[PDB]
């Protein structure tokens, strides 16, 4: 097998994954497990909108992307993460290059998402496929942007990307490349294409235009989420802080 960080790993995963397809019954079980896993992720997600969007995105990919099904099937049959085991989080971190006057995410205000100097916004999402100490896998990712937002398809594609790390064991390029996507992003882009998610045609995982697109997508998703909860702004930033501190927030979003 190719190394998990080389582009070749993508087509390898799919070739092997296609050998044992998911029956409509297998798919049905996967489907229900994802519904459960996403619902169980409420306590680490910023809002119900984000819960809904994660579920919709993953289920739509299972329903309409052969590539995603092939990747998911690969993991089930080849000792990677079974997609139904993955839970979801919206962890953020302070931007250490920033200017903004805050000790913690809990004290942040919506004004501070606009009024800061340079390109140093106060916080960034943590976007990663990790596991907790009981080896239970999770994806941390940006809060969901608004329905019908410019940011939605890129957000969806990036979410699928992190899931691909778990379900296929793929990695990103070892070096910062402007001409190689890496096998995880290759697969995520194929899923996006099959689903009609409009994303920019980047060639390199770390190319400056991609990095800029991501930061701006994340900042706007955060601004949009904060605005959705303008009525309960302090509760919104406290919840984001609670999640980022790795504690459980209300699974029923009672602060809203
Ligand atoms: Zn990645």
3 state SS for the chain: CCCCCCCHHHHHHHHHHCCCCCCHHHHHHHHHHHHHHHHCCHHHCCCHHHHHHHHHHHHHHHHHCHHHHHHHHHHHHCCCCCHHHCEEECCEEECCCCCCCCCCHHHCCHHHHCCCCCCCCCEEECCEEEECCCCCEEEECCCCCCCCCCCHHHHHHHHHHHHHHHHHCCCCCCCCCCCCCCHHHHHHHHHHHHHCCCCCCCCCCCCHHHHHHHHHHHHHHHHHHHHHCHHHHHHHHHHHHHHHCCCCCCCCCCCC
Residue 184 alpha carbon to ligand 1 centre in Å: 6
Contacts of 168 (CB under 8 A, 6+ apart): 9, 13, 71, 74, 75, 80, 183, 184, 187
Query: What's the 231 CA to ligand 1 centre distance in angstroms?
Result: 35
Counting the structural domains of the chain, the total is 1
Cα 180 to middle of ligand 1, angstroms? 13
- Are 222 and 85 spatial neighbours (Cβ–Cβ below 8 Å)? no
How far is the centre of ligand 1, averaged over its atoms, from the C-alpha of 170 (Å)?
8
Instruction: Give 159 Cα–ligand 1 centroid separation in angstroms.
Output: 10
Please indicate if the annotation marks 165 as binding a ligand: yes
Range of the structural domain that residue 221 is part of: 1-256
User: Ligand 1 centre and the CA of 254: distance in Å?
Assistant: 33
How far is 108 from 221, CA to CA, in rounded Å?
16
């Amino acid at each position: 097998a190719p190394n998990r960080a080389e582009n070749a790993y993508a087509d390898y995963v799919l070739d092997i994954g296609k050998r044992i397809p998911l029956s409509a019954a297998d798919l049905s079980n996967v489907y229900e497990s994802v519904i459960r896993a996403v619902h169980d992720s409420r306590s680490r997600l910023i809002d119900q909108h984000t819960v809904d969007m994660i579920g919709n995105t993953v289920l739509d990919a299972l329903s309409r992307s052969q590539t995603f099904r092939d990747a998911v099937s690969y993991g089930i049959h080849n000792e990677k993460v079974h997609i139904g085991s993955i839970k979801y989080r919206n962890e953020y971190e302070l931007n250490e290059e920033s200017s903004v006057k805050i000790d913690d995410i809990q004290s942040l205000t919506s004004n501070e998402l606009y009024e800061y100097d340079v390109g140093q916004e106060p916080i960034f999402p943590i976007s990663e496929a990790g596991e907790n100490d009981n080896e239970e896998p999770y994806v941390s990712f940006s809060v969901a942007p608004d329905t019908d937002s410019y940011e939605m398809p890129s957000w969806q594609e990036g979410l699928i990307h992190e899931i691909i790390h778990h379900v296929t064991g793929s990695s990103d390029p070892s070096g910062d490349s402007n001409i190689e996507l890496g096998p995880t992003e290759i697969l995520a882009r194929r899923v996006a294409q099959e689903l009609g998610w409009s994303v920019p045609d980047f060639k390199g995982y770390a190319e400056p235009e991609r990095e800029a697109h991501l930061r701006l997508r994340n900042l706007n998703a955060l601004r949009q989420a904060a605005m959705r909860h303008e009525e309960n702004e302090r509760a919104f930033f406290e919840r984001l802080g609670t999640i980022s501190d790795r504690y459980e927030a209300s699974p029923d979003f009672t602060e809203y």
